[PDB]
Ligand binder design. Structure first.
Ligand code: GAL
Ligand code: GAL
Ligand code: NI
Lengths: 346, 339
């Protein structure tokens, strides 16, 4: 079933229920996921109205771009030319600049294919918006099927050579309560390397480092607490995790990451080369989610994209987008029950 | 009463019925008026869904800007520096450039005041959007009251020196049918001069012209047909009217124009210095409104704003907006029914 209703400020809330009873919802404010539940339990973080997003935190579950993450000094080089983008975090351009895409009302169309329902959001980034050459016609399709698969498909075309590397900023919390840390969740991730940050400003350090056999090594499933409790400089620097992890093997076919809690797991699939992992290291900020004060580590993203920092570490990728060339990206989060035995205590 | 409904593509349709039974409706797509009816007749031009607007003509009833009208070569000078805006009509920037604010979904809030209801639409135009320095936070409040007054109030603030001169692009047609010319409407307008156009590109010619005692003098009520059958080269050039008229006396308390058809009449009030009047000179285009094929002259605007063309004719005014200054503007359309 598909259902729609006003969600506040002129946005809508689109709610889908698949044949298995699993429900998921989205809003056109920032082509974002708002909730995902199983048996009355929230699997992710979200608010109950649009205004909350605009007043508390506009990133959760949003589509962010045109470029996700931080661009040192808001400086990019496009086809030999230097361009300065909107600087919204010190001299840095973070997630596309101020008042970016996550803050706009996108138009949308719903397509019912039976076992699969698609929600296609559209938006045009005009040429010059936030310093980005365009115009860029963008679309984000969120779909949910009878197999409990939530897929995100991005498409874009630009009138001018530009840069593009958007991502989906969902936060998971299998506790279903923001006030409970995710240190009790199990994490498996197919990555042997990571990108260290230079300092508190969070720009990339300039090197790529091997994390095998360190506390950041999740190739084999381990509790998140191992990371959180770590005293590695990088962990200490950000008070948790806030880094790009370079996938070892590329392809939409491989299970790149798996987040487990008791009988529930979320599997991550993507065609992107990295997963940006941020554990809501907000300290005592305590943003209220459903009347619950969020705890430090009360959430975790799996933001699949080209790693941030390619401006400095070319080896990471090229996020340039040629005029006329069609961009595409696909990320999938699949939900499973009893995939494995995970019985722990903290 | 107030009613909100899904207007298509994720947009909303907000409809307000006042004590008098009159209905007016807006959509956040473009912070725009969609309809205006009395006794089941439409007073203005509009479509039946969001899609129509996007597919057919996106300007009718919309808020257009940041700058309304045509800008020669898309060139504006800001703080002594030249800036090139998005060009979407040849080398000209028309209505803000392509995919402008009239095509975006704005957020909004409804405020019920009893005798009056207000719908406040907001949108942020990012710095650099279509070439315009910003960011510019804009709000357009459309309101409707029990006195049949439809008011539009604009507000904006920019982080940087920029240009700003939006307008409301509603088209009236008291016939209540797009297939019927507005030539039978009487028009009165308190302007003694106008701004001639250079040629078919419609950029201004460069001069200000006195229209006293010409086919374009509406200082004293007259039927449109007159203007329509004039041989004035300017009328001929455009096949109707498509010009900025300079108002004789500025101020929001003066009725600046009046459109009448039989017992029904519309009055215009504004704090703007000019009114741009365009008579739907679309030839055979035949755009479809409520399944009725539009005829050349099947509509007319009253776009209140600072006259287009100030880039060439400084005396027309100055559309600059300095960083931190608050822009404000108001236009009112009042409905009357004789007895
Ligand atoms: O709240 C927004 C967040 O977006 C990413 O996770 C970023 O790396 C974090 O450092 C933080 O800025
Ligand atoms: O519908 C678009 C119209 O907008 C203005 O009123 C302009 O003067 C007309 O020439 C036409 O471009
Ligand atoms: Ni709606």
């Amino acid at each position: 079933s598909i259902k729609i209703r006003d969600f506040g400020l002129g946005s809508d809330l689109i709610s889908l229920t698949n044949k298995a009873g699993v429900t998921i919802s989205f809003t056109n404010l920032g082509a974002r996921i708002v909730d995902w539940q199983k048996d009355g339990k929230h699997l992710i973080l979200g608010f109950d109205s649009a205004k909350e997003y605009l007043e508390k935190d506009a990133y959760p579950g949003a589509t962010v771009g045109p470029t996700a993450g931080r661009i040192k000094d808001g400086l990019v080089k496009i086809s030999g030319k230097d361009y300065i983008l909107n600087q919204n975090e010190g001299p840095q351009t973070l997630h596309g600049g101020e008042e970016s895409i996550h803050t706009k009302l996108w138009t949308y169309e719903v397509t019912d294919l039976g076992a699969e329902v698609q929600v296609k959001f559209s938006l045009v980034s005009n040429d010059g918006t936030n310093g980005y050459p365009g115009k860029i016609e963008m679309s984000v399709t969120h779909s949910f099927d009878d197999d409990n698969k939530w897929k995100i498909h991005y498409e874009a075309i630009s009138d001018k050579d530009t840069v593009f590397n958007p991502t989906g900023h969902v936060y998971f919390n299998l506790n279903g309560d923001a006030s409970e840390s995710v240190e009790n969740h199990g994490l498996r991730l197919a990555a042997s390397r990571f990108v260290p940050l230079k300092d508190q400003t969070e720009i990339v350090r300039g090197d790529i480092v091997d994390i095998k056999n360190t506390d950041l090594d999740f190739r084999q499933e381990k509790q998140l607490s191992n990371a959180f409790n770590s005293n590695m400089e990088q962990v200490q620097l950000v008070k948790g995790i806030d880094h790009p992890f370079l996938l070892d093997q590329l392809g939409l076919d491989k299970e790149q990451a798996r987040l487990t809690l008791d009988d529930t797991s979320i599997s991550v699939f993507t065609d992107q080369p990295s997963i940006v992992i941020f554990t809501a290291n907000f300290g005592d900020l305590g943003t209220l989610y459903h009347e619950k004060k969020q705890v430090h580590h009360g959430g975790i993203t799996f933001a699949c994209q080209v790693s941030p920092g390619s401006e400095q570490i070319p080896e990471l990728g090229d996020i340039s987008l040629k005029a006329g060339e069609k961009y595409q990206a696909t990320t999938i989060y699949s939900l499973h029950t009893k995939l494995e035995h995970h019985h722990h205590h903290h």
